[PDB]
Amino acid sequence: MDQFREIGEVLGSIRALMVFKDSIQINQRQCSLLLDLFTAAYESISVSMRSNLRFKEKNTKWKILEQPLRELLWVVREGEAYVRMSLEPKLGFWAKAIVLHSNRDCTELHIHNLLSCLPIIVEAIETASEVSGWDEEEMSKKRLVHSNKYMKQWNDSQMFTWKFGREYLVTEDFCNRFESAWTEDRWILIKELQEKKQSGSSKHERKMADFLLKHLGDGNESPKLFPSSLLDNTKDYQVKKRLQYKEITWLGESFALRHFFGDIDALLPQITPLLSLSHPNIVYYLCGFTDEEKKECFLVMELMRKTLGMHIKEVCTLSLPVAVDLMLQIALGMEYLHSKRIYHGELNPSNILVKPRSNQSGDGYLLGKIFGFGLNSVPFIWYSPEVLEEQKYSDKSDVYSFGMVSFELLTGKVPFEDSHLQGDKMSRNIRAGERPLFPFNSPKFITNLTKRCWHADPNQRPTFSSISRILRYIKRFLALNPECYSSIAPTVDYCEIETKLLQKLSWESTELTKVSQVPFQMFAYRVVERAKTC
Amino acid sequence: MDQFREIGEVLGSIRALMVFKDSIQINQRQCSLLLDLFTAAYESISVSMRSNLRFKEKNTKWKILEQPLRELLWVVREGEAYVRMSLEPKLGFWAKAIVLHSNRDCTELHIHNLLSCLPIIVEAIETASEVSGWDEEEMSKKRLVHSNKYMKQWNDSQMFTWKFGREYLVTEDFCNRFESAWTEDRWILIKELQEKKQSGSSKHERKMADFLLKHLGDGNESPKLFPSSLLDNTKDYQVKKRLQYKEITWLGESFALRHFFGDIDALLPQITPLLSLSHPNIVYYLCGFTDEEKKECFLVMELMRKTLGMHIKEVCTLSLPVAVDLMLQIALGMEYLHSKRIYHGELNPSNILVKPRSNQSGDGYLLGKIFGFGLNSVPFIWYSPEVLEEQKYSDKSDVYSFGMVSFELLTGKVPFEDSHLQGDKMSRNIRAGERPLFPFNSPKFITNLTKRCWHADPNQRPTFSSISRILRYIKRFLALNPECYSSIAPTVDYCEIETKLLQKLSWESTELTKVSQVPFQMFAYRVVERAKTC
Amino acid sequence: MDQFREIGEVLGSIRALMVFKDSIQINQRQCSLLLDLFTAAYESISVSMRSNLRFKEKNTKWKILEQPLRELLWVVREGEAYVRMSLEPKLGFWAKAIVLHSNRDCTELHIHNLLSCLPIIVEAIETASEVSGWDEEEMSKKRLVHSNKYMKQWNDSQMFTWKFGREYLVTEDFCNRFESAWTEDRWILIKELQEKKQSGSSKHERKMADFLLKHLGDGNESPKLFPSSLLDNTKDYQVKKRLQYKEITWLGESFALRHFFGDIDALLPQITPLLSLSHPNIVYYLCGFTDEEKKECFLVMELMRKTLGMHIKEVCTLSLPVAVDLMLQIALGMEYLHSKRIYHGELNPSNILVKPRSNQSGDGYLLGKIFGFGLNSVPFIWYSPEVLEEQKYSDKSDVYSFGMVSFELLTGKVPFEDSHLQGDKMSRNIRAGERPLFPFNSPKFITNLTKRCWHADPNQRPTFSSISRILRYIKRFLALNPECYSSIAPTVDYCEIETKLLQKLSWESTELTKVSQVPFQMFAYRVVERAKTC
């Protein structure tokens, strides 16, 4: 309680907002899905607290539920902000359509956080139930139930969805709605645009509707660039001064504008893949503009200002949960990029734009995105060793970079501060097995990822689809016992678990993990720990 | 919006609290009724905003809904406090049973406030709908609908319950549950006590169960006093020092104790009616104790410390809504007392105990009760003139007092400050038609009650069942236009309306008004105003 | 009761069927809409019986509710048959997709019948409430309420949707779902076909998916004809012997095949409009086939065998409700055809294919469709007089025919049986004002349509959008008092009402009436009767 009730009230606030459902023009289906999932998670949590916990012992034996319920509170509070963003009338219909036509914020931010936060709450409730009561027979029986839940024979996605599907909101109906709730509003938007295509008020809107219809999968002709006159024509199109990126504000909502000169027709086949991307942790290109297939191209982005590099030096460090959330978001971005066969050439702290959360959720929490991956064509620290000894954008050459930034987030210091005495001798040193050293205070479980991404052998570095699912499980552990971040470390090394599960479950078959698989993965990790209690 | 969403979230908080419904031992039925009414009111308000209002004009044309929705927010926030009071484990079962066995706080405080606040919201929504939109034809049509709603032929309780029952939460099911939800938990408490009567742990609890079973309608033998040994026997019974009222804390919850010496057997038939009372605005006697039908009697009360008299002099004034709420609560208390043929001998500011609200609801709002009415047996301002010229506890002799205190609440000054020069000549002056004069700033509508309660003729003073229903309608008007309290006054005199409706509807037949009749009365008042627009 | 409970149980049966919702491949949205409307109608009817009627008088004073509730029972029983048709696995996915890709049976048959049957039930409940009870004051008050409901100032679609929207299931949400529940499953079908376009098992299915994708609004290129090889290629394509119409069974479901020889490329622009039609009372063309734009064209239809002409002579007559339902269905078909600027050249009893209902609903009830309207290019009774004196497919020249068939349905005899003595003198007689005479037993209200469609002046014949809304109101009257069909006739002539409402409400502006307008029209008719009680 006192966190559970806050979740209930935030959910009620979302329901009150969603009363005016039809006022949402673009996210009606996604907002409805968010409501239908938050309500289901709340129902399951309430039922499991009724069945398991005793209210008489509210103030003493529920201390373990405080932080998982806080994290679920934060997830629901971010869902509420998403609904208010999708429902507010501050921005016009066109400014909203340019931004939210290919959002995917729902299933990748909010649904993903919810489905990675429910296992923590469920497991915490079980652990609180075992110590609940005064009868040792009850405690032993509950321990037996929970030990038979996490036994090894329940290691299969279909086994888990059968036995434990309803508990973790992975059911056939929910799994179907995770995907068919973004195509549904896409179709509705196409219909609403076709109506404005011929019944619009102005000729400029006549062209805007054609622009967006061709921009959204008309004839499956997705990769294309439209005349830049649309930017100029709009009643208001003031291009603000840059501080290659400029602050266009062409629908009244400020956007970042990247414009470059080159033979765009020749550079077309490599920007064609780039315009298709859409991920919450990616600063992707909303629309593309060329004048008349001529000199210049206009690429419009979402506007973010502060980077992680100049944010850390602003506040100086970051707490462990904040660093872990940043790492998880960055890893989720990179696994999406790698799933689409394009690799950030160099990943640096500077190349990570961050923006703080609602600030109603937590203190110091912030969500960050990655940019600059596209158009590789047109110091020596974040480079991988073999690339550093080059006298090429590999999938493993930036996993090293991600681990390098991971060290930076944890210790809060730019790496190789101590080696500053050496001048350019670092380049030869990195070839040798020398890596920056952690402070001893840093917890063992987290820093093992940095040691494993630092590994000299390119093959042994874990993929991003494995780093992400390690990180969200470390977030689970960091949620159960807050005292760890504020020897509290677990027993098993999580990387060892990943190595075991990759061969056992064949998780390497899929480059990217769909959201409906998140609770099963966090469940499989717990099974391997339980089998390794010894 | 922004008040509606807050109501939604407070309602969600109440639902989260009520998840642990079975942990409530005494108010499960009443808490369920509160939830089922708040949910229904919220559903009707949401439906009426969907049908009537346009979300595009949220920020400009919804200014009139701010204050009625604030008042409903306050009512729901008080319902939430009631639920947390009835559900918290801070107090033991016995300490809870002594206080809440005859509460009636639900239907008299919370349900009454809800049913007097819904008409304000509904009427405000209609007025906001008329000005909504940009089409004058829509405005004219909505004006026609609302003018045909408030036309004269819909003046009957049954007519109104037919046409407008569902809108104002007065339906046969709701009206039945207003009464059969306090008998239901009374029966459950009797059953739970009979179980502890024979299966209790201790002999002291054996006697406690017998005490409460005989105290609660066993054989319809309601008026009786039990041996005082029960106070002494309890593991802890420290009687605190008085500051005839003492602070007994005999179940760990502090109570006010009134104890007096006399031939209690002779005084029994007049205290017998007194022990039956129960009202939220009455400091009533929970239990009665005599040693062995001997010298002393022990009367236990609910503990309140600060009175209205020494509260007003603390903060010095009170705003108009605060004064009106105090007046409404006092009038509701007195109409209950008068309905039970017992009259406060003298009603003074001092004899009104006040306690501030949750303070989450509003600033300066406070709920007050009246005490000292019982046991009349064993300066000259608040007395009525004819009583003042006595050289006797009539129902009209304290209506004068209530109006006198009403003047005190409004002007914030003790009356006859100016006449302080005269010494005891006031007594003859009151016989003459001289009454304290208001400041001109005071609004006309409110002060007409004080002029009408001041009236020299005892007959012409309105009854309390009429003063209450005048006051709640003035609260409605004061809710629609906040600028009135912070010529804004209405056209018709409300007292004139009361005189019209008493003969037209025969409201004088009933001394006390049941809560299911509140929206109809506020509806009948509005009909009479509309007929008198001229 | 005893009809209401049967409706409840049939609705429960539909819910049980719809449990396996995902097994429906094509009508999931339409079946969900049917369930969501039947449930809402049932909820409103139950609430209105709770509020209005007394259960103590179940067996005596509820005789008037028997037949309207029977008709609603029949509507729900047809909805259940629709669900079982859309959900059964008897037919394959392709055989289902050919038939149900452009069904529109939901909103035109089932939703239309439901929305034309609710006003009858509501009005019957009001009339049963007035006579309910033993207190004459209650009766007078209820009469006042119902007389103020049907007063003249509530004559506007928006006025009615405001005051009485929720009662008759015409709300903004319901009105939106009447249309956006057939585009929703169309989009889903397109997506499911695109998946089979590239991931199908066989090459034949590869071509089938392309066929249906191009057939369903791909690029807004709707009017086209596909190579006939698709008929031949399918594993099974036996063409059965004709009994120009042949019984193709090319997906295992028997279809009627119309094939003709001509310069199809030259006849293309007039068959192009024809392929777009879809109505429950129209035998429309599902798909079009030409070999290689060569000699022959293959037109596939839905298979029906028995016509109205050889059905009436089979059973010999038809009861009045059966005849009225046939007339209403035929009028609904013709108003759709006339809305699309194409007119049946000649409308005859033979050119009306009929098929009996579920037979669980009623005895002798049957739904009929009209065919043969298309491809006009390539005795003298049903022709209109001016056409009969031609020595041309006008919208009024077949309204005469519909009235002629209307006479045939009522009297059950082929017209001009008596004039059989005259040989070809009928042709001159029809030019003179001579029309077949009715039996005197036939009710006045029904036969006035036949007299008005018979009218010599072509202009004065009512349009089909007016004949339909006359007919459904006569169905309402015929539902209230069964004894009429088994002087019971009303007072006002319904045609007079139509003439009044056309100028008052400007109903002639719209050629076709959308289903969301049906209850308002039946409400406006009742208002005009009530104003004409005198």
Side-chain angles (χ1 to χ4, degrees), chain C residues 108 112-113 279 281 327-337 464 468 472 513:
Chain C
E108 311 325 329
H112 175 280
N113 294 12
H279 199 272
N281 305 120
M327 293 180 184
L328 184 49
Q329 282 154 1
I330 292 161
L332 278 170
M334 311 295 288
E335 80 163 359
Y336 179 79
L337 281 178
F464 271 117
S468 84
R472 75 189 60 158
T513 61

Side-chain angles (χ1 to χ4, degrees), chain B residues 202-242 244-448:
Chain B
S202 176
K203 184 192 321 293
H204 180 265
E205 289 189 0
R206 285 288 205 284
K207 304 213 321 293
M208 211 75 168
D210 302 332
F211 176 74
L212 272 168
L213 285 172
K214 297 188 294 294
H215 202 314
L216 304 179
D218 197 21
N220 198 21
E221 297 293 329
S222 301
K224 58 189 58 180
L225 284 77
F226 306 93
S228 63
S229 306
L230 282 87
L231 284 180
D232 314 337
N233 288 197
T234 63
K235 281 196 170 180
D236 276 334
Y237 171 49
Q238 182 291 149
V239 62
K240 196 170 292 296
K241 58 185 66 61
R242 48 181 268 261
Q244 204 187 51
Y245 292 102
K246 287 198 168 186
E247 290 86 299
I248 189 167
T249 78
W250 68 289
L251 274 297
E253 155 67 4
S254 58
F255 296 114
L257 182 63
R258 187 192 192 185
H259 62 87
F260 55 108
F261 304 85
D263 174 350
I264 301 299
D265 203 328
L267 267 51
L268 191 53
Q270 65 182 177
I271 195 167
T272 296
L274 213 60
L275 285 187
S276 178
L277 318 182
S278 77
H279 199 272
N281 305 120
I282 279 182
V283 180
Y284 57 102
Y285 303 106
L286 297 172
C287 295
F289 301 126
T290 75
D291 173 40
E292 291 179 353
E293 309 159 11
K294 294 173 31 53
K295 294 195 170 186
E296 184 178 1
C297 178
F298 277 106
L299 278 191
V300 66
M301 272 155 47
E302 201 196 70
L303 181 56
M304 293 177 70
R305 294 178 182 88
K306 178 151 298 203
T307 75
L308 186 149
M310 61 205 178
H311 168 81
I312 290 173
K313 85 168 52 57
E314 156 181 347
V315 309
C316 308
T317 69
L318 283 72
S319 66
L320 263 191
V322 175
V324 170
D325 272 336
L326 261 175
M327 293 180 184
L328 184 49
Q329 282 154 1
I330 292 161
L332 278 170
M334 311 295 288
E335 80 163 359
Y336 179 79
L337 281 177
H338 288 43
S339 68
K340 288 212 171 302
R341 314 262 76 89
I342 62 170
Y343 320 92
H344 215 315
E346 73 296 26
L347 201 168
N348 307 317
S350 316
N351 265 293
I352 302 159
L353 315 176
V354 303
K355 163 174 66 70
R357 290 271 186 74
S358 67
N359 292 317
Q360 195 75 36
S361 64
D363 295 322
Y365 280 91
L366 60 84
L367 61 91
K369 310 163 176 280
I370 62 170
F371 87 101
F373 51 89
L375 277 296
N376 46 4
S377 71
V378 194
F380 59 109
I381 295 91
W382 323 92
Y383 293 99
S384 69
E386 78 296 351
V387 169
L388 183 63
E389 309 285 337
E390 188 75 1
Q391 273 72 242
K392 299 299 299 175
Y393 302 147
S394 82
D395 61 357
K396 300 287 192 176
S397 60
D398 55 0
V399 177
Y400 177 92
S401 306
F402 165 64
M404 254 312 301
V405 178
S406 173
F407 169 91
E408 201 285 349
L409 280 178
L410 301 180
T411 77
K413 317 185 296 284
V414 298
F416 302 81
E417 163 194 27
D418 288 305
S419 82
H420 76 281
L421 314 168
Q422 311 177 13
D424 197 23
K425 314 312 301 283
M426 304 144 177
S427 48
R428 185 88 36 81
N429 205 9
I430 305 299
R431 188 259 180 276
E434 190 271 355
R435 257 67 163 191
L437 57 86
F438 272 96
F440 64 92
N441 267 22
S442 281
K444 284 312 301 283
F445 39 93
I446 283 287
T447 67
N448 263 358

Side-chain angles (χ1 to χ4, degrees), chain B residues 6-43:
Chain B
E6 300 291 325
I7 297 177
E9 83 177 15
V10 165
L11 194 40
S13 159
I14 296 177
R15 261 195 295 275
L17 276 164
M18 262 295 268
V19 175
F20 294 77
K21 177 161 39 62
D22 308 335
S23 310
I24 317 177
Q25 286 145 315
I26 311 182
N27 298 117
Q28 182 181 332
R29 290 307 198 265
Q30 303 193 52
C31 290
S32 300
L33 179 61
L34 268 183
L35 195 61
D36 291 358
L37 289 182
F38 290 169
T39 290
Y42 182 76
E43 292 287 323

Side-chain angles (χ1 to χ4, degrees), chain C residues 75-93:
Chain C
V75 166
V76 186
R77 253 175 198 163
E78 294 319 302
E80 178 190 34
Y82 176 81
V83 173
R84 293 179 293 173
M85 183 278 288
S86 44
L87 177 136
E88 69 199 340
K90 296 308 212 204
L91 280 70
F93 165 86

Side-chain angles (χ1 to χ4, degrees), chain B residues 47 50-52 135 137-139 141-142 144-145 148 151 153-159 162-163 166 172, chain C residues 47 50-52 135 137-139 141-142 144-145 148 151 153-159 162-163 166 172:
Chain B
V47 171
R50 283 320 320 300
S51 309
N52 289 343
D135 183 4
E137 299 319 318
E138 305 298 328
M139 297 182 155
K141 298 167 79 71
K142 290 173 187 174
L144 185 63
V145 181
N148 280 187
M151 65 182 179
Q153 38 185 338
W154 319 124
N155 262 341
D156 186 74
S157 55
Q158 194 165 4
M159 191 76 38
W162 284 342
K163 288 196 62 71
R166 294 151 301 291
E172 205 49 10
Chain C
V47 171
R50 284 321 320 300
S51 309
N52 289 343
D135 183 4
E137 299 320 318
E138 305 298 328
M139 297 182 155
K141 298 167 79 71
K142 290 173 187 174
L144 185 63
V145 181
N148 280 187
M151 65 182 179
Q153 39 185 338
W154 319 124
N155 261 341
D156 186 74
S157 55
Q158 194 165 4
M159 191 76 38
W162 284 342
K163 288 196 62 71
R166 294 151 301 291
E172 205 49 10

